[PDB]
C-alpha cells in the first residue's frame, strides 16, 4: 500500500518522464492535469480487478417487509442514507468501512442460519434472482431473514479530495501493468501519428504483463478443493 | 508601413495576409454550401494554402 | 450510478481531452455540441444492452375488450398519458419508476391466474403473437384477464432537457466501452484521414473490451438451472 | 416511434454533422436538400424490412364475380377508388388505416370460413396462384367468398407533405443501421475519392450491425412451434 502521491512520483519518474505535464523537478504531475490521471487510474484498476480475482469482499443485507428488490447502492447504507426519503436502511456497514458500491459480480449468498442460497436457479422456487448485476431480488422476505452476499469487489475509487480514498492496495507485481495502461491512455489522447505508435506499445506491454502473471499464477488465482461428489454420489 | 498592416493577430482583420485568408476561405465555403466538399476536405485545402 | 454531468467531465478529462470540443479548463463540453454527445450516448447504451442481458424489467398489461393489439408505448401507461386522447390506459406503473418505453425482446408472459402463456406458437390455439417486436397481440381478450410481460430492457433515453432522464445505470466495468464508442463516432465524423485511422482504433478497443467481459463473465450473462425434464420424461 | 424531424436532428448531430447540407445551428438539414434524405430514408427502410421479418400486416379482399386477378393496389381500395372507372372496390380498409400498397411477400391466405388456402400449388386444383408478387389470382370466385391475406409488410413511405406519413416505427436497435445506410448514400453521391473511402466504411458498418442483430436475435426473428406431424403421421 502507498499514497497516490507516490503514484504521481512514480509516473513522473517513469513512463511520463518526457512529458509536458510533469513539474520542472520531475517530482509531481501538474496540478491542473491531475484529474486526467485520476480518471485513467480508476479505469485501469477496474480492468485489473476484473481479469484477476484479487479482492473478495462481503456485505450484509437485512430483509425488509414489503420489499423484494434490494439495490446495492450507498444511499441504502446505514452510514449514508438520507432519512428524508428512506424509511430505514437495509445495508449494514461501519463508520470507518462505509459501503462504496464496489460490487462487480456476486459469488455466493448465505443466510443468517448458515444455509447456502442458490442464485439464478429458475427451476428452484426458493432460489434468488438478480435482474441487474448490482441488484439483489428476494421473492419471499421473512421476518428475521438476514442475507450475507460475498462478491468480487473492485478497488475503491480514488479521489484527490481529503475525505476520499488516497491509497492503492494492489499486488506490487502488477505495478508495471498499471503504469502501462495509464501511459496508453495518455499517448492515445494525443492525435499525432508518432504518439499513436508509442501508445500501442504500452498497451501491448500491458497485455503481456497480465498474461505473464496468469502463466505463473502469482496472484493465487487458481483454486482447488477436496472432492465431495464421491460421497454424495454414493460410490463409497 | 508597419507589421500591423501586413497582418493582424485576429483572423479576418484588415491585414493583407488576413484578407487573403478570408477570401480563400469564402471561395472554398461557396462549394461547401453547394454540397460537393466535406468539412474535413474543406479545412485540409484551406491549411495547404497558408 | 452517476448523473449525466459526470459523464461530460469524465469525457473532457478522458478520451476527448485533446480535441477542441471541451472548454478552456477541460472541465465540461460546449453547450453547442452537448446534444451531439447525447445522440452518441443513447446509441452506445443501446448496443451494450443488446449484446448483454444486463437489465430485465416486467410490465403489467390489463386486457380491454375490442382491442387485440397492445403496443408497449409510453402514451398507453397509467402515468404520463393524455386522458383526452386515450380514455383508459392499460399499462400499470402506479408504483416505482414510470414506464420508460425500453422494450427490446419479449422473454416470457404470465397471466394473473399464475400460468404461463405460450408465445409465438403457431400450432398452439391459446398462444400469443407478436406481429411487431414492441407490439403484443392477444386473440381473445377476457373480462378480467391481466398479463405480465418479462422482457430484456434497454437503458432509458437520456436527455439534457428539463424534467428529462439524466442518470446512467450501467456496470462500471463497461465504462471504457462507452467512452470508446462515443469517441469512435466523434472522430469518424470529421472526414479526415488522420482522424479516420484514430476512429478505427477506438472501435476495435470497444469490441476488445466487450469480448473481455464475455471471456471472464463479469456480467453473469450465463444462466443454468436444475434439470426438470428428468422427472417429466419419467426416467425416475 | 418519433417524428421525421427528430430523424433530421439525429442526422444533423450525427453522421452528417460535418456536411454542408446542415443548418448553421446543426439543428436541421437544409430545406432544399430534404427530399434527398427522404428518398434515401425510404430505400433504407425497405432493405431492413426485407432481411428482418419485423412487420406482419394483413388485408381483406372480397371476391368479385367475373374477376380472377386481384391486384393489391390502392386504386382498388374502398377509401381510394375512383368511381368513374372502378365499378366497385374489393379491398376493404378503414378511413384512418388506408391501404398503402406495402405488400412485400405473401405468407398465408385464409378464407372467411377459416380454411387455409394453399398458394402456388400447381398440382392442387383449389390452390391459389400469384402471377405477380403483388397480384393475387383466384380461379374460382364464389358468391360470398372473402379472402384474408397475411403478408410481410414494408414501412409506409415517408413524405414531407402534411397529409403524408411523418413517423418512423422501427426497433431502436436498428437506428445506427438506418443512419449508416443514409450516410453511405450521401457520401457515395460525392465523386471525390476521399468520400468514396468514407462511404464504404458506413456500408460495412451497416452490414455489421445487421449481422449482430441476427446473431443475438434481438428482433425475435427465429420462430418455432410444437410438432404436429407426430399425430398426423400416426406414430402415436
XYZ file of C-alpha atoms in Angstrom:
758
model
C 0.000 0.000 0.000
C 1.134 3.535 -0.796
C -0.289 7.011 -1.231
C -1.482 8.336 -4.577
C 1.325 10.905 -4.335
C 3.858 8.085 -4.671
C 1.975 7.016 -7.796
C 2.392 10.556 -9.125
C 6.126 10.448 -8.387
C 6.443 7.009 -9.988
C 4.677 8.233 -13.127
C 6.739 11.438 -13.086
C 9.980 9.424 -12.900
C 8.590 6.651 -15.102
C 6.734 6.416 -18.401
C 5.714 10.097 -18.271
C 9.265 11.320 -17.607
C 9.447 13.007 -21.038
C 6.030 14.694 -20.973
C 4.944 18.297 -20.590
C 2.521 17.557 -17.739
C 5.247 16.964 -15.139
C 6.805 19.539 -12.843
C 10.180 21.107 -13.611
C 11.821 18.961 -10.913
C 10.127 15.760 -12.187
C 8.652 15.350 -8.710
C 4.929 15.564 -9.410
C 2.365 15.870 -12.182
C 0.923 19.286 -12.991
C -1.943 20.139 -10.655
C -4.375 21.043 -13.443
C -3.546 17.744 -15.188
C -4.027 15.631 -12.042
C -7.732 14.799 -12.674
C -6.744 13.366 -16.065
C -4.511 10.792 -14.364
C -7.111 10.046 -11.677
C -9.771 9.152 -14.251
C -7.331 6.899 -16.108
C -6.076 5.343 -12.864
C -9.576 4.318 -11.767
C -10.257 2.828 -15.202
C -7.022 0.820 -15.083
C -7.809 -0.576 -11.628
C -11.249 -1.747 -12.777
C -9.780 -3.826 -15.611
C -7.190 -5.476 -13.356
C -9.767 -6.461 -10.732
C -11.953 -7.958 -13.466
C -9.440 -10.279 -15.103
C -7.888 -11.218 -11.743
C -10.000 -12.259 -8.745
C -7.813 -10.360 -6.293
C -10.309 -8.827 -3.842
C -13.187 -10.792 -2.295
C -15.424 -8.660 -0.073
C -18.760 -9.399 1.583
C -21.729 -7.255 2.609
C -24.691 -7.731 4.948
C -28.262 -7.112 3.764
C -31.333 -7.133 6.011
C -34.654 -8.175 4.503
C -37.401 -5.563 4.849
C -41.103 -6.377 4.771
C -42.857 -5.418 1.549
C -39.614 -5.065 -0.437
C -38.323 -7.576 -2.993
C -35.634 -5.678 -4.925
C -32.566 -4.683 -2.887
C -30.192 -2.492 -4.915
C -26.623 -2.458 -3.612
C -26.281 1.319 -3.519
C -24.673 3.544 -0.902
C -27.907 5.524 -0.482
C -29.412 2.470 1.252
C -26.471 2.072 3.649
C -26.928 2.923 7.316
C -23.928 5.284 7.243
C -25.053 7.190 4.133
C -28.855 7.010 3.844
C -30.982 10.148 3.880
C -33.872 9.810 6.368
C -35.967 12.273 4.341
C -36.770 9.765 1.581
C -35.539 6.454 3.066
C -37.652 4.995 5.864
C -34.848 2.709 7.055
C -31.591 1.425 5.539
C -31.076 -2.284 4.960
C -27.352 -2.380 4.069
C -25.272 -2.524 7.253
C -21.700 -1.234 7.435
C -19.365 0.572 9.827
C -18.379 4.217 10.167
C -14.795 3.549 9.087
C -15.807 0.975 6.453
C -18.607 2.739 4.593
C -20.080 0.851 1.648
C -18.565 2.134 -1.600
C -20.684 0.304 -4.226
C -17.668 -1.774 -5.295
C -19.785 -4.746 -6.426
C -18.636 -6.437 -9.646
C -20.012 -9.994 -9.625
C -21.954 -11.901 -6.974
C -20.349 -15.211 -5.990
C -22.405 -16.772 -3.182
C -25.148 -15.858 -0.714
C -25.618 -17.272 2.791
C -28.487 -16.522 5.155
C -28.227 -15.854 8.887
C -28.893 -19.545 9.625
C -25.938 -20.770 7.558
C -27.743 -22.244 4.537
C -26.424 -21.616 1.038
C -28.974 -19.886 -1.187
C -28.960 -20.742 -4.914
C -28.764 -17.830 -7.348
C -30.472 -17.525 -10.745
C -31.950 -21.036 -10.476
C -35.178 -20.626 -12.432
C -36.499 -24.096 -11.553
C -35.877 -23.662 -7.806
C -38.726 -21.809 -6.043
C -36.549 -20.731 -3.097
C -33.671 -19.509 -5.280
C -32.767 -15.832 -5.506
C -32.579 -13.784 -8.696
C -30.508 -10.849 -9.956
C -32.422 -8.831 -12.571
C -29.456 -6.430 -12.591
C -25.771 -7.112 -11.862
C -25.819 -4.859 -8.773
C -29.427 -5.549 -7.696
C -30.441 -8.466 -5.465
C -34.038 -9.709 -5.549
C -35.718 -11.874 -2.907
C -39.189 -13.212 -3.669
C -40.085 -14.173 -0.069
C -38.899 -11.758 2.639
C -39.338 -13.402 6.032
C -39.471 -11.810 9.489
C -35.868 -12.054 10.728
C -34.217 -13.114 7.461
C -30.738 -11.610 7.033
C -28.588 -12.334 3.979
C -24.820 -12.119 3.533
C -23.530 -11.589 -0.010
C -19.930 -12.425 -0.921
C -18.805 -10.908 -4.209
C -15.762 -9.989 -6.245
C -15.014 -6.345 -5.476
C -13.223 -3.558 -7.316
C -10.694 -1.226 -5.761
C -12.323 1.821 -4.124
C -12.430 4.833 -6.419
C -9.563 7.258 -5.880
C -10.186 10.955 -5.303
C -7.962 13.982 -4.760
C -10.289 15.241 -2.015
C -9.073 14.838 1.556
C -12.118 12.853 2.693
C -11.839 10.498 -0.283
C -9.583 7.490 -0.632
C -5.920 8.260 -1.297
C -4.272 4.823 -1.137
C -3.725 1.954 -3.574
C -3.875 -1.704 -2.499
C -2.815 -3.936 -5.402
C -0.159 -6.635 -5.767
C 3.177 -4.988 -6.491
C 3.799 -7.344 -9.424
C 1.010 -5.539 -11.319
C 2.502 -2.051 -10.939
C 4.072 -2.082 -14.452
C 0.664 -3.099 -15.814
C -0.952 -0.131 -14.062
C 1.669 2.271 -15.426
C 1.405 0.869 -18.957
C -2.366 1.366 -19.128
C -2.101 4.941 -17.838
C 0.651 5.621 -20.372
C -1.502 4.111 -23.123
C -4.422 6.385 -22.233
C -2.220 9.492 -22.210
C -0.454 8.824 -25.514
C -3.719 7.780 -27.174
C -5.212 11.162 -26.250
C -2.593 12.916 -28.374
C -3.621 12.592 -32.018
C -0.128 12.864 -33.506
C 0.745 9.716 -35.504
C 4.071 9.330 -33.688
C 2.309 9.173 -30.320
C -0.173 6.635 -31.710
C 2.610 4.130 -32.405
C 4.040 4.665 -28.916
C 0.588 4.216 -27.366
C 0.137 0.774 -28.931
C 3.459 -0.419 -27.493
C 2.376 0.292 -23.914
C -0.997 -1.398 -24.442
C 0.728 -4.475 -25.865
C 3.186 -4.385 -22.959
C 0.279 -4.143 -20.511
C -1.335 -7.232 -22.036
C 1.976 -9.112 -21.932
C 2.390 -8.408 -18.209
C -1.131 -9.643 -17.444
C -0.624 -12.942 -19.271
C 2.745 -13.442 -17.565
C 1.031 -13.223 -14.171
C -1.588 -15.737 -15.320
C 1.108 -18.046 -16.701
C 2.995 -18.239 -13.394
C -0.117 -17.727 -11.206
C 1.468 -15.085 -8.995
C -1.883 -13.953 -7.535
C -3.096 -17.440 -6.495
C -5.959 -17.119 -8.976
C -6.230 -20.889 -9.436
C -8.255 -22.626 -6.728
C -8.928 -26.298 -5.990
C -10.815 -28.169 -3.289
C -11.231 -31.700 -1.994
C -13.728 -33.823 -3.899
C -17.145 -34.111 -2.254
C -19.246 -35.638 -5.055
C -17.638 -39.016 -4.313
C -19.560 -39.274 -1.038
C -22.728 -37.657 -2.400
C -22.880 -39.961 -5.433
C -22.662 -42.922 -3.049
C -19.601 -44.535 -4.629
C -18.248 -45.362 -1.149
C 4.496 50.570 -43.314
C 4.099 48.601 -40.082
C 3.694 44.924 -39.261
C 0.081 45.653 -38.287
C -0.836 46.415 -41.906
C 0.727 43.162 -43.130
C -1.354 41.050 -40.746
C -3.452 41.404 -37.605
C -3.357 38.900 -34.756
C -7.122 38.473 -35.142
C -8.462 36.386 -38.016
C -10.394 38.284 -40.663
C -8.800 41.635 -39.856
C -7.688 44.437 -42.144
C -4.249 42.927 -42.736
C -3.216 41.930 -46.240
C -2.419 38.414 -45.029
C -5.782 38.300 -43.250
C -7.617 39.426 -46.392
C -6.162 36.583 -48.462
C -7.142 34.025 -45.814
C -10.752 35.217 -45.682
C -11.002 35.490 -49.474
C -9.623 31.971 -49.932
C -11.929 30.597 -47.229
C -15.023 32.188 -48.782
C -14.369 30.579 -52.171
C -13.958 27.158 -50.555
C -17.074 27.692 -48.429
C -19.032 28.549 -51.586
C -18.606 24.971 -52.809
C -19.122 23.735 -49.240
C -22.703 25.025 -49.360
C -23.037 23.542 -52.867
C -22.750 20.012 -51.393
C -19.583 18.962 -53.203
C -16.873 19.002 -50.493
C -16.961 17.643 -46.955
C -15.947 19.651 -43.909
C -12.741 17.679 -43.456
C -11.851 18.162 -47.116
C -12.557 21.901 -46.893
C -10.270 22.567 -43.925
C -7.455 20.482 -45.423
C -7.391 22.597 -48.589
C -7.554 25.793 -46.519
C -4.482 24.829 -44.479
C -2.466 23.792 -47.542
C -2.559 27.382 -48.862
C -1.363 29.029 -45.635
C -24.768 5.028 -10.986
C -23.820 8.631 -11.747
C -25.537 11.657 -13.234
C -25.061 12.877 -16.796
C -22.925 15.798 -15.584
C -20.093 13.488 -14.516
C -20.067 11.886 -17.973
C -19.188 15.216 -19.594
C -16.462 15.846 -17.013
C -15.101 12.319 -17.447
C -15.035 12.665 -21.240
C -13.472 16.132 -21.014
C -10.740 14.771 -18.727
C -10.648 11.473 -20.625
C -10.505 10.374 -24.252
C -11.742 13.732 -25.603
C -9.197 15.819 -23.678
C -7.129 16.740 -26.739
C -9.988 17.806 -29.014
C -11.463 21.300 -29.018
C -14.981 20.224 -28.059
C -14.112 20.780 -24.393
C -13.942 24.068 -22.500
C -10.748 26.029 -21.887
C -10.243 24.385 -18.483
C -11.143 20.906 -19.832
C -13.961 20.705 -17.299
C -17.050 20.443 -19.497
C -18.289 20.159 -23.079
C -19.542 23.133 -25.073
C -23.294 23.702 -24.951
C -23.354 23.957 -28.755
C -22.269 20.299 -29.013
C -23.909 18.699 -25.960
C -26.754 17.086 -27.989
C -24.118 15.538 -30.265
C -22.759 13.553 -27.315
C -26.291 12.670 -26.184
C -27.125 11.095 -29.548
C -23.916 9.055 -29.415
C -24.503 8.172 -25.754
C -28.007 6.869 -26.473
C -26.666 4.831 -29.395
C -23.838 3.364 -27.306
C -26.123 2.295 -24.452
C -28.483 0.502 -26.844
C -25.624 -1.573 -28.270
C -24.416 -2.651 -24.823
C -27.908 -3.647 -23.674
C -28.323 -5.725 -26.837
C -25.170 -7.805 -26.521
C -25.569 -8.293 -22.758
C -28.726 -9.188 -20.826
C -27.901 -6.700 -18.085
C -31.396 -5.338 -17.392
C -34.627 -7.316 -17.035
C -37.908 -5.492 -16.427
C -41.560 -6.504 -16.282
C -44.781 -4.631 -17.035
C -48.451 -5.209 -16.234
C -50.998 -5.097 -19.068
C -54.759 -5.094 -18.478
C -56.797 -6.607 -21.301
C -59.538 -4.426 -22.787
C -62.342 -5.881 -24.888
C -62.446 -4.909 -28.547
C -58.656 -4.467 -28.719
C -56.336 -7.219 -29.946
C -53.044 -5.306 -30.325
C -51.382 -3.828 -27.226
C -48.369 -1.685 -28.155
C -45.943 -1.137 -25.278
C -45.776 2.628 -25.705
C -45.456 5.340 -23.080
C -48.725 7.048 -24.038
C -50.747 3.951 -23.056
C -49.401 3.845 -19.490
C -51.357 4.951 -16.438
C -48.617 7.571 -15.955
C -47.561 10.209 -18.500
C -50.600 9.695 -20.728
C -53.156 12.056 -22.225
C -56.647 11.488 -20.762
C -58.119 13.365 -23.730
C -56.567 11.013 -26.300
C -56.792 7.579 -24.641
C -59.772 7.059 -22.351
C -58.374 4.139 -20.343
C -54.664 3.243 -20.250
C -53.836 -0.451 -19.977
C -50.225 -0.270 -18.707
C -49.942 -0.005 -14.920
C -46.885 1.555 -13.260
C -48.627 3.009 -10.210
C -45.543 2.382 -8.049
C -41.849 2.828 -8.702
C -40.355 4.387 -11.797
C -42.541 5.301 -14.755
C -42.649 3.170 -17.892
C -39.705 4.362 -19.991
C -40.600 2.555 -23.260
C -37.453 0.418 -23.320
C -38.713 -2.848 -24.822
C -36.265 -4.850 -26.946
C -37.257 -8.529 -26.849
C -40.111 -10.315 -25.087
C -38.924 -13.264 -22.986
C -41.987 -14.760 -21.280
C -45.599 -13.878 -20.492
C -47.504 -14.850 -17.343
C -51.171 -14.112 -16.708
C -52.869 -13.182 -13.439
C -54.003 -16.787 -12.917
C -50.366 -17.811 -12.404
C -49.861 -19.962 -15.510
C -47.523 -19.434 -18.456
C -48.947 -18.327 -21.801
C -47.094 -19.721 -24.846
C -45.576 -17.047 -27.072
C -45.390 -17.106 -30.885
C -46.586 -20.727 -31.029
C -48.387 -21.024 -34.359
C -49.753 -24.514 -33.627
C -50.995 -23.611 -30.129
C -54.590 -22.283 -30.175
C -54.151 -20.271 -26.954
C -50.713 -18.818 -27.744
C -49.983 -15.111 -28.011
C -48.385 -13.499 -31.055
C -46.049 -10.564 -31.704
C -46.682 -9.072 -35.161
C -44.175 -6.360 -34.195
C -41.260 -6.546 -31.735
C -42.780 -3.947 -29.386
C -46.429 -4.920 -30.012
C -48.175 -7.717 -28.111
C -51.224 -9.336 -29.715
C -53.957 -11.249 -27.882
C -56.604 -13.058 -29.922
C -59.149 -13.488 -27.085
C -59.351 -10.662 -24.536
C -61.322 -11.769 -21.488
C -63.227 -9.782 -18.873
C -60.578 -9.689 -16.127
C -57.520 -11.147 -17.865
C -54.280 -9.391 -16.892
C -50.906 -10.227 -18.441
C -47.389 -9.713 -17.093
C -44.604 -9.440 -19.674
C -40.944 -10.087 -18.861
C -38.598 -8.571 -21.430
C -34.996 -7.518 -21.938
C -34.988 -3.767 -21.303
C -32.541 -1.180 -22.598
C -31.433 1.869 -20.654
C -33.971 4.731 -20.642
C -33.315 7.501 -23.140
C -31.097 10.290 -21.829
C -31.981 13.933 -22.389
C -30.469 17.228 -21.261
C -33.864 18.951 -21.424
C -35.792 19.900 -18.302
C -37.629 17.090 -16.483
C -35.756 14.518 -18.575
C -33.757 11.448 -17.617
C -30.193 12.355 -16.626
C -28.911 9.281 -14.765
C -26.710 6.474 -16.100
C -27.047 2.956 -14.655
C -24.533 0.554 -16.212
C -21.953 -1.787 -14.674
C -18.727 0.100 -14.042
C -16.650 -2.437 -15.988
C -18.387 -1.316 -19.207
C -17.430 2.355 -18.777
C -14.339 2.105 -21.055
C -16.546 0.576 -23.757
C -18.942 3.527 -23.517
C -16.124 6.057 -23.888
C -14.541 4.180 -26.799
C -17.794 4.024 -28.769
C -18.557 7.722 -28.237
C -15.033 8.680 -29.303
C -15.368 6.439 -32.361
C -18.407 8.357 -33.614
C -16.810 11.756 -32.972
C -13.551 11.093 -34.822
C -15.193 9.274 -37.737
C -17.465 12.288 -38.319
C -14.556 14.617 -39.154
C -13.995 13.014 -42.597
C -10.243 13.353 -42.066
C -7.810 10.530 -42.951
C -5.746 11.252 -39.836
C -8.871 11.138 -37.663
C -10.321 8.160 -39.552
C -7.372 5.969 -38.553
C -7.789 7.039 -34.923
C -11.526 6.322 -35.109
C -10.922 2.736 -36.243
C -8.674 2.064 -33.242
C -11.356 3.172 -30.774
C -13.947 0.908 -32.405
C -11.596 -2.073 -32.119
C -10.877 -1.157 -28.493
C -14.614 -1.055 -27.771
C -15.045 -4.528 -29.265
C -11.975 -5.778 -27.389
C -13.412 -4.656 -24.042
C -16.773 -6.313 -24.708
C -15.206 -9.663 -25.602
C -13.045 -9.416 -22.477
C -16.210 -9.098 -20.382
C -17.711 -12.168 -22.064
C -14.480 -14.140 -21.624
C -14.390 -13.619 -17.849
C -18.203 -13.344 -17.499
C -18.218 -10.204 -15.371
C -21.926 -9.560 -16.046
C -23.116 -13.063 -15.044
C -24.671 -13.316 -18.500
C -24.714 -17.120 -18.443
C -27.582 -18.904 -16.712
C -28.059 -22.548 -15.728
C -30.746 -24.304 -13.718
C -31.560 -27.704 -12.268
C -32.807 -30.136 -14.894
C -36.554 -30.750 -14.680
C -37.022 -32.871 -17.818
C -35.649 -35.911 -15.968
C -38.872 -36.328 -13.991
C -41.057 -35.056 -16.842
C -39.848 -37.833 -19.153
C -40.433 -40.416 -16.420
C -36.846 -41.660 -16.213
C -37.200 -41.978 -12.418
C -41.845 5.982 -32.653
C -40.707 9.521 -33.423
C -41.255 12.257 -35.975
C -39.151 12.592 -39.108
C -37.934 15.918 -37.697
C -36.162 14.022 -34.913
C -34.520 11.934 -37.634
C -33.322 15.167 -39.241
C -31.908 16.358 -35.911
C -30.254 12.986 -35.296
C -28.631 13.078 -38.734
C -27.675 16.733 -38.230
C -25.990 15.898 -34.904
C -24.785 12.517 -36.163
C -23.017 11.189 -39.245
C -23.829 14.334 -41.259
C -22.507 16.701 -38.578
C -19.600 17.795 -40.814
C -21.578 18.307 -44.031
C -22.636 21.399 -45.937
C -26.312 20.396 -46.079
C -26.988 21.110 -42.394
C -28.172 24.375 -40.886
C -25.760 26.783 -39.208
C -27.044 25.717 -35.774
C -26.764 21.987 -36.636
C -30.465 21.690 -35.829
C -31.910 20.608 -39.167
C -30.989 19.648 -42.715
C -31.233 22.263 -45.454
C -34.783 22.529 -46.767
C -33.802 22.168 -50.430
C -31.754 19.065 -49.538
C -34.568 17.435 -47.535
C -36.017 15.390 -50.457
C -32.578 13.823 -50.952
C -32.687 12.386 -47.426
C -36.322 11.295 -47.789
C -35.572 9.213 -50.889
C -32.597 7.578 -49.168
C -34.574 7.031 -45.956
C -37.353 5.145 -47.751
C -34.781 2.991 -49.549
C -33.043 2.149 -46.266
C -36.312 1.142 -44.590
C -37.167 -1.218 -47.456
C -33.909 -3.150 -47.062
C -34.326 -3.522 -43.294
C -37.886 -4.840 -43.586
C -36.720 -7.361 -46.190
C -33.888 -9.002 -44.274
C -35.824 -8.860 -40.986
C -39.443 -10.024 -40.703
C -40.391 -7.170 -38.389
C -43.864 -6.133 -39.591
C -46.645 -8.631 -40.337
C -49.808 -6.988 -41.667
C -52.980 -8.468 -43.142
C -55.539 -7.233 -45.669
C -59.092 -8.240 -46.589
C -60.062 -8.972 -50.204
C -63.614 -9.602 -51.416
C -64.110 -11.862 -54.423
C -65.999 -10.227 -57.295
C -67.911 -12.166 -59.933
C -66.200 -12.332 -63.312
C -62.787 -11.295 -61.947
C -59.841 -13.644 -61.395
C -56.837 -11.328 -60.972
C -56.920 -9.107 -57.871
C -54.019 -6.632 -57.845
C -53.175 -5.269 -54.400
C -53.221 -1.613 -55.407
C -54.633 1.391 -53.571
C -56.821 2.292 -56.562
C -58.969 -0.765 -55.762
C -59.367 0.168 -52.084
C -62.725 1.402 -50.827
C -61.131 4.544 -49.357
C -59.210 5.480 -52.520
C -61.025 4.070 -55.567
C -62.338 6.343 -58.302
C -65.980 5.511 -59.137
C -65.518 6.836 -62.687
C -63.537 3.799 -63.872
C -63.980 1.323 -60.981
C -67.415 -0.265 -60.657
C -66.799 -1.332 -57.054
C -63.706 -1.749 -54.858
C -62.790 -5.150 -53.461
C -60.017 -4.209 -50.994
C -61.551 -3.184 -47.664
C -59.816 -0.825 -45.239
C -60.628 1.980 -42.808
C -60.525 5.755 -43.139
C -57.646 6.086 -40.679
C -55.882 2.942 -41.938
C -55.914 3.417 -45.705
C -54.168 0.720 -47.724
C -50.672 1.882 -48.687
C -49.547 -0.913 -51.063
C -46.928 -2.078 -48.545
C -47.008 -5.705 -49.742
C -43.616 -7.436 -49.934
C -44.235 -11.195 -49.749
C -47.436 -13.171 -49.213
C -47.254 -15.608 -46.292
C -50.663 -17.271 -45.883
C -54.260 -16.887 -47.052
C -57.399 -17.802 -45.096
C -60.969 -17.629 -46.361
C -63.985 -16.331 -44.448
C -64.817 -19.877 -43.290
C -61.428 -20.422 -41.638
C -59.814 -22.848 -44.101
C -56.188 -22.400 -45.117
C -55.777 -21.936 -48.867
C -52.609 -23.323 -50.499
C -50.580 -20.922 -52.633
C -48.671 -21.712 -55.840
C -49.556 -25.421 -55.622
C -49.686 -26.363 -59.298
C -50.999 -29.887 -58.652
C -53.822 -28.691 -56.368
C -56.923 -27.574 -58.315
C -58.254 -25.414 -55.463
C -54.911 -23.710 -54.788
C -54.380 -20.020 -55.488
C -51.686 -18.549 -57.722
C -49.624 -15.351 -57.793
C -48.552 -14.479 -61.352
C -47.021 -11.301 -59.893
C -45.603 -10.665 -56.406
C -48.313 -8.080 -55.623
C -51.147 -9.692 -57.628
C -53.450 -12.387 -56.235
C -55.283 -14.697 -58.643
C -58.323 -16.832 -57.817
C -59.515 -19.298 -60.449
C -62.982 -19.909 -58.933
C -64.706 -16.847 -57.445
C -67.724 -17.986 -55.443
C -70.760 -15.989 -54.302
C -69.832 -14.888 -50.766
C -66.153 -15.878 -50.813
C -63.966 -13.443 -48.854
C -60.208 -13.929 -48.518
C -57.795 -12.612 -45.892
C -54.145 -12.272 -46.920
C -51.393 -12.065 -44.299
C -48.085 -10.812 -45.669
C -44.762 -9.317 -44.681
C -45.149 -5.549 -44.974
C -42.747 -2.669 -45.514
C -42.772 0.556 -43.552
C -45.153 3.154 -45.033
C -43.409 5.575 -47.366
C -42.402 8.833 -45.702
C -43.375 12.188 -47.181
C -42.745 15.807 -46.226
C -46.363 16.688 -47.047
C -48.681 17.259 -44.098
C -51.208 14.623 -45.182
C -48.464 12.035 -45.691
C -46.824 9.876 -43.064
C -44.308 11.643 -40.829
C -43.408 8.970 -38.260
C -40.951 6.071 -38.100
C -41.785 2.771 -36.376
C -38.684 0.556 -36.282
C -36.826 -1.191 -33.459
C -34.473 1.284 -31.816
C -31.580 -1.189 -32.036
C -31.579 -0.678 -35.826
C -31.229 3.117 -35.687
C -27.429 3.024 -36.285
C -28.096 0.785 -39.292
C -30.564 3.331 -40.676
C -28.094 6.188 -40.186
C -25.219 4.233 -41.742
C -27.144 3.484 -44.941
C -28.227 7.118 -45.312
C -24.634 8.219 -44.728
C -23.435 5.692 -47.310
C -25.860 7.043 -49.914
C -24.810 10.647 -49.276
C -21.053 10.054 -49.390
C -21.391 7.786 -52.430
C -23.115 10.628 -54.295
C -19.981 12.758 -53.977
C -17.471 11.553 -56.563
C -14.337 12.671 -54.715
C -12.059 9.683 -53.973
C -11.759 10.657 -50.303
C -15.536 10.489 -49.865
C -15.614 7.112 -51.633
C -13.418 5.534 -48.952
C -15.590 7.037 -46.208
C -18.746 5.776 -47.930
C -17.539 2.166 -47.892
C -16.891 2.322 -44.139
C -20.511 3.213 -43.367
C -21.832 0.487 -45.676
C -19.575 -2.076 -43.997
C -20.682 -0.757 -40.602
C -24.323 -1.058 -41.673
C -23.795 -4.699 -42.644
C -22.008 -5.399 -39.353
C -24.935 -4.020 -37.338
C -27.438 -6.163 -39.248
C -25.496 -9.381 -38.651
C -25.077 -8.518 -34.964
C -28.863 -8.314 -34.606
C -29.220 -11.673 -36.364
C -26.504 -13.204 -34.176
C -28.245 -12.267 -30.917
C -31.790 -12.421 -32.379
C -32.891 -9.099 -30.917
C -35.982 -8.863 -33.162
C -37.371 -12.344 -32.344
C -36.859 -13.337 -35.978
C -36.467 -17.023 -35.110
C -39.767 -18.857 -34.667
C -40.602 -22.388 -33.519
C -43.816 -24.305 -32.927
C -44.984 -27.536 -31.339
C -44.656 -30.610 -33.534
C -47.880 -31.695 -35.236
C -46.609 -34.229 -37.796
C -46.222 -36.766 -34.975
C -50.002 -37.094 -34.676
C -50.646 -36.794 -38.417
C -48.091 -39.478 -39.309
C -49.852 -41.803 -36.859
C -46.798 -42.599 -34.737
C -48.949 -42.396 -31.580
